[PDB]
Design a binder for this molecule. Sequence first.
Ligand code: HEM
Ligand code: HEM
Ligand code: HEM
Ligand code: HEM
Lengths: 146, 146, 141, 141
Amino acid sequence: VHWSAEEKQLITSIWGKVNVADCGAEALARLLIVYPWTQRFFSSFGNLSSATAISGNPNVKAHGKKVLTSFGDAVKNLDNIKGTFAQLSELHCDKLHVDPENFRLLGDILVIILAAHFGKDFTPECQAAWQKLVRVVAHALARKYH
Amino acid sequence: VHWSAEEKQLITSIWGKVNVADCGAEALARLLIVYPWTQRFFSSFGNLSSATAISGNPNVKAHGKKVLTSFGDAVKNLDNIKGTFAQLSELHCDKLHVDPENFRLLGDILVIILAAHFGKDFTPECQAAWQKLVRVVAHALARKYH
Amino acid sequence: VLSANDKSNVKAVFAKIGGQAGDLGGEALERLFITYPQTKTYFPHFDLSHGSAQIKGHGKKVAEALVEAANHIDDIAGALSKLSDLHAQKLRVDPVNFKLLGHCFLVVVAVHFPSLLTPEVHASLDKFVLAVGTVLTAKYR
Amino acid sequence: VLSANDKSNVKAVFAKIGGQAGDLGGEALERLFITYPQTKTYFPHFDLSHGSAQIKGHGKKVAEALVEAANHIDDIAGALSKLSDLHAQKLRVDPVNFKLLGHCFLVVVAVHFPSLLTPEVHASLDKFVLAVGTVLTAKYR
Ligand code: HEM
Ligand code: HEM
Ligand code: HEM
Ligand code: HEM
């Protein structure tokens, strides 16, 4: 992966300004609502039995914040994403057995969440840069395979 | 990617008995017939008008042999698959714009072709090693992407 | 098949923003081409320059098909009959690309109508765009 | 949709397999767990050791269901409706795993009946196992 000055600016600016708590909670809730098989991995989180329940679930909300904070670790060193996600890759692959397609789905959800948060400031170029970022992150998490 | 002695032996022993012309003809015909959108990439190959025409097409046969010979280059140096396929990645990604999912589908087809040819010698462990090989090749071919 | 609830969510969405759907289609397509540049190779006969009237014209048509599908949501296959043979038989569009365009449509909806796109509505719209993509690629399966 | 020729091909395959179906189901499942180890996560209540009687017994159930789908190939959704509820609502099986198992079934057919699995019959059987997977994931749509 190569990052242009323009891509770095688009990524860093959105990160600085994003509400990490609210957008992280939103991304996780939407993953669980839109793609409900993902609920299987979160059975310790309690009530996931409705969209309302998922969105109000304090464990979902707190975990969502952790997740977007972790995407923040990608932002902070864009040329070291592989290393940043090595330990998380062991977790998600070897321990939790999450198929990598779900990393793609969460990336797509995050893009939609950012689009909602930023409106027209989330230009097509901004979208391009962020979809590139979530794809790089997903690639780094799906390593302990191939 | 790490390859055990056992995995290496399952791969090379099968490969030593592969007829690349026959297996390659089978694999490419099956790609074009089973996943017909792939025909888009092979417009210059002539008659792809029916399943029968595709199996009888000499250009499909010839190209199939080249594809299998290439898989042979992976078998010959399992630890250097990334390097071996770097140039082919330029061709497939930057010039042909083949979505990587199609590399997975061709891999699955190759596994079925080997199963058909080798029958009871294509044990579950042999299948696991070959599926691993085709995934590692696919990831090498997709290198030019994320 | 889409549930009664999903159908109502789709109709609620297009009944509100159907007037803008044409413009939204143009933007969705612009975003497809910029976010996933490989998709431009399906359009070598278009002017794919940013701003281009052909992109805008064509996105308008994509959105109008979605609106037709919404208006006849109980038989989307029927509604989009010609279009299906077009995409799978004639054009041989790789099925992966339908999820990319459907996602771009959701992105445009989020950009312009954030309070409309609740998680429930997002779920229903995702199912809808996938149902359309499935109809258009039906000959593959 | 499955064409008439696809249906002929599928029924021919299952007629050939005949009473071996149960055993081939066990083999498909054994291959699933060995080739795609992540799938073992769904069976923590099973003995999953090599040779496991529980794997073989379960494979027979899977093959019984495929046989019924072949016998009712004109309406797979109808025949397997409650199986879909089980897999999607109760078990929350990731949709990707249906493609993996379907593939394992084709591999088993290839091992045992290579002359039957021509490219055309391969295409028909692929469409079949994908149609079954699509039915079983229905409650995700
Ligand atoms: C692709 C981007 C993803 C990122 C950046 C991410 C990030 C994280 C982080 C930072 C943790 C905390 C690790 C710890 O406490 O040791 C975590 C845990 C976890 N993740 Fe992810 N994740 C991603 C995708 C997914 C997906 C797609 C799923 C399931 C569909 C998933 C399921 C889980 C589960 C079940 C946990 C453990 C939760 C717990 O019990 O505390 N993750 N993830
Ligand atoms: C994943 C394993 C694959 C391997 C090992 C492979 C191998 C090759 C090789 C060795 C060549 C010839 C390069 C040359 O002659 O200089 C080639 C060309 C080509 N490949 Fe692949 N390929 C793979 C997958 C695919 C797939 C999945 C598609 C499309 C769905 C595809 C489409 C093509 C096309 C269109 C050409 C050019 C043929 C021509 O000369 O017109 N390849 N490939
Ligand atoms: C649900 C998603 C989609 C919808 C509703 C849709 C809709 C349409 C419509 C209404 C047309 C009619 C143009 C005409 O009649 O001249 C068309 C044509 C076309 N579509 Fe799509 N489409 C979709 C997805 C895609 C995708 C994913 C691609 C490829 C990336 C694609 C590529 C094309 C091309 C190349 C044409 C011919 C354009 C022309 O020559 O004017 N479509 N589509
Ligand atoms: C071809 C697609 C499949 C078919 C036809 C099928 C069929 C079946 C049948 C017939 C049963 C239980 C019989 C009964 O209770 O009456 C079952 C249960 C089950 N299936 Fe599947 N299945 C398929 C795919 C999958 C996949 C891909 C997975 C996960 C990787 C899976 C996981 C399970 C689990 C965990 C059970 C419960 C088993 C138990 O508690 O003993 N199934 N399936």
